Design a protein around this nucleic acid. Structure first.
Ligand code: SF4
Ligand code: NA
Length: 344
DNA sequence: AAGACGTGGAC
DNA sequence: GTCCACGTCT
């Protein structure tokens, strides 16, 4: 009863659609940026970042031409920073390989880094009208309730199944609208907790509602790392920072020099990291920072740095008022915050 | 197949 | 505390 389903869904969407910043138009760049920003991030969090980011990088080409530090700094605080290194690389490739036009073919677009099955669907359906499914966590919830699908959401195959369902029931007349409506339904009505079934526009089609199980769907299924962090100031009040490797945790972000210590075993593995001259006094605060897959237990040790050689490697001597220029992870932003109200 | 990869806010 | 949060890449 897909034509039935479509009308009721599409009609609700026309009345209820939020005026989000990225819905001002269907510019593929604009759509693409927002969809990358919205991955594992709440709409409310994204709104300010999207605006500053577009203000700063108005077009695809502006973004491609920007320094990566510039781009990381625009992302600073959003999390999952490889989203933006991927977006940046991908956007560079569209400029050069595709004349600056986001490819409207699913296979070509999917090949860009950071661009996966969901992003292909979202961007190409919204921006160009391509009939590809755009199945996110939202959509998976909706479809898992509509169709009483009890496969584990984490399984790669479950997503494939959902996409089949979309290809079957999608309004091919208007795929962007259909895809966006499915998403908005998940965002506003068919919510993780307490879905608003009595108000849902597609309730008559929904099995979970008829079975009394809306809330139990979809079905679905961390290590500790101790860290010592050094804040080292000149007599000129210039602070020692460093850029992280381009691979792995918090890639390419700047940090106050640190190392994993495994147990509260000293400030010496800190004082060790030489290659220039430092004595370290007693630590001033200790807090912890959660990631998705680990927790940092941080201890920050204030210190005095003397120059006895050049500054190379990934380290860099930044004066105090220039720290605000670099992208720091939130954890290391707090390290600095504590260090400063300390020195009061 | 499943772990890496941030962050903040509702509950 | 938990869940959001499949999103993508590995
Ligand atoms: S009826 Fe309840 S469960 Fe079924 S789609 Fe609408 S909100 Fe989701
Ligand atoms: Na890809």
């Amino acid at each position: 009863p897909a034509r039935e389903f479509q009308r009721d869904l599409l009609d609700w969407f026309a009345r209820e659609r939020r005026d989000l910043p990225w819905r001002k138009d269907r510019d593929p760049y604009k759509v693409w940026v927002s969809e990358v920003m919205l991955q594992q991030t709440r709409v409310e969090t994204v709104i300010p970042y999207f605006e500053q980011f577009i203000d700063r990088f108005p077009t695809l080409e502006a973004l491609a031409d920007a320094d990566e530090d510039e781009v990381l700094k625009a992302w600073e605080g959003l999390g999952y920073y490889s989203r933006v290194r991927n977006l940046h690389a991908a956007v560079k490739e569209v400029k050069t390989r595709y004349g600056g036009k986001v490819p409207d073919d699913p296979d070509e677009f999917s090949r860009l880094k950071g661009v996966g099955p969901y992003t292909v669907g979202a961007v190409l359906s919204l921006a160009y009208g391509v009939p590809e499914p755009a199945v996110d966590g939202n959509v998976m919830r909706v479809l898992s309730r509509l169709f009483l699908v009890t496969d584990d959401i984490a399984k790669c195959s479950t997503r494939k199944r959902f996409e089949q369902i979309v290809r079957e029931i999608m309004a091919y007349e208007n795929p962007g609208a259909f895809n966006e409506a499915l998403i908005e339904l998940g965002a506003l009505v068919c919510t993780p907790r307490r879905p608003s079934c009595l108000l849902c526009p597609v309730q008559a089609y929904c099995q979970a509602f008829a079975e009394g199980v809306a809330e139990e769907l979809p079905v679905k299924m961390v290590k500790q790392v101790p860290l010592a962090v050094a804040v080292l100031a000149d007599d000129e009040g210039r602070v020692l920072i460093r850029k992280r490797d381009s691979t792995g945790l918090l890639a390419n972000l700047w940090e106050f020099p640190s190392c994993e210590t495994d147990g509260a075993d000293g400030k010496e593995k800190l004082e060790q990291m030489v290659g220039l001259q430092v004595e370290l006094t007693e630590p001033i605060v200790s807090f912890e920072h959660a990631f998705s897959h680990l927790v940092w237990q941080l201890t920050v040790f204030p210190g005095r740095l003397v120059h006895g050689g050049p500054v190379e490697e990934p380290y860099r001597l930044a004066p105090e008022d220039e720290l605000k220029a670099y992208a720091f992870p939130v954890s290391h932003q707090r390290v600095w915050r504590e260090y400063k109200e300390w020195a009061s």
